[PDB]
Design a protein around this ligand. Structure first.
Ligand SMILES: O=C1c2ccc(O)c(O)c2C(=O)c2c(O)ccc(O)c21
Length: 327
């Protein structure tokens, strides 16, 4: 059976915590007053909620209200407890209140307002310096949550809200996030296709914080190369093929062999044999102003098949890539 794995950082942070901290099933929600909030416009509907701009009539401040869909009941206190544990952390969206919605008969999460410009629009615009700046800001959020014993598990451009006027960033949508417990097996049906780590794509359940660094790597490749998404598979199987076209099949085998994992035999007629490519292969006239030797080396160090070999958030913030960014 599979060889076990553990995180190389913050391995035991929840084992030394009081039970209250990670046992979200036992959490008692503190409900505020639903009358304080007035919905103004619908912003989006996801798998698991509907999201509104709203106004808080006790301070007239703009807020965001997320009304949960009545499904997968356990996710609900998990998300609340994670948001309460991380509140006040660098670049972590601030849960301001929780109220009972009388129409949906579910919890509605009330957050601080962020005035995001659209990722597709905003990616078209980032300068070299701005990619580095914003990458550092996200790393702050990820190191904070990882050091608090939590993995986000859905890092992607849609979940990283940016107010480009005020140069301010928030990591949102903690509904897939989980507590890291050494040796725990996790569901591999997390993150969105283009951002799933190789561990997910080969059905390896004993993963950790390092999943988020694979996703961050995919976001970085998409920005510096100006190709959205960078690994563009048709489904979860083709997703691994597209990765193996860049990383190579020999290092994929080395990975699965290390953890004594077998690929789904459905890979037998689709995977082929591929060499590992040099990252320069993806550079052209239209993206070259976004690329540098430091950018390519930092990317190379995030996008590893072996989750254990990837830079930690802390180590990524140390990287030469960020030397040009003002502290
Ligand atoms: O602020 C959030 C926001 C803040 C916290 C969340 O957990 C969240 O899912 C969202 C969110 O989904 C969202 C959106 O879809 C569109 C515009 C937004 O401002 C947001």
């Amino acid at each position: 059976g599979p060889v076990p794995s553990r995180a190389r950082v913050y391995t035991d942070v929840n084992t030394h915590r009081p039970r209250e901290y990670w046992d979200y099933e036992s959490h008692v929600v503190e409900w505020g007053n639903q009358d304080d909030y007035q919905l103004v416009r619908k912003l989006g509907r996801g798998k698991y909620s509907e999201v509104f701009e709203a106004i808080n009539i006790t301070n007239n401040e703009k807020v965001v209200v997320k009304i949960l869909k009545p499904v997968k009941k356990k996710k609900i206190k998990r998300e609340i407890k994670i948001l309460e544990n991380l509140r006040g952390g660098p670049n972590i969206i601030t849960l301001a209140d929780i109220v009972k919605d009388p129409v949906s008969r579910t919890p509605a999460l009330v957050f601080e307002h962020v005035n995001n410009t659209d990722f597709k629009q905003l990616y078209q615009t980032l300068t070299d310096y701005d990619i580095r700046f914003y990458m550092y800001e996200i790393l702050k959020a990820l190191d904070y949550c990882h050091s608090m014993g939590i993995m986000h598990r859905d890092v992607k451009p849609h979940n990283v809200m940016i107010d480009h006027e005020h140069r301010k960033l928030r990591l949102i949508d903690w509904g897939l996030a989980e507590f890291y417990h050494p040796g725990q097996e996790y569901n591999v049906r997390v993150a969105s296709r283009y951002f799933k780590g190789p561990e997910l794509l080969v059905d390896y359940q004993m993963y950790d914080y390092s999943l988020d660094m694979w996703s961050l790597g995919c976001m970085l490749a998409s920005m510096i190369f100006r190709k959205e998404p960078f690994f563009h598979g048709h489904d979860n199987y083709d997703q691994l093929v597209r990765i193996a076209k860049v990383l190579g099949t020999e290092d994929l085998y080395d990975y699965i062999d290390k953890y004594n994992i077998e690929l789904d035999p459905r890979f037998n007629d689709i995977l082929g044999r591929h060499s590992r490519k040099r990252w320069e292969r993806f550079v052209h006239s239209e993206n070259q102003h976004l690329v540098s030797p430091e950018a390519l080396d930092f990317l190379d160090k995030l996008l590893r098949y072996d989750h254990q070999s990837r830079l930690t958030a802390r180590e990524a913030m140390e990287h030469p890539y960020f030397y040009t960014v003002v502290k």
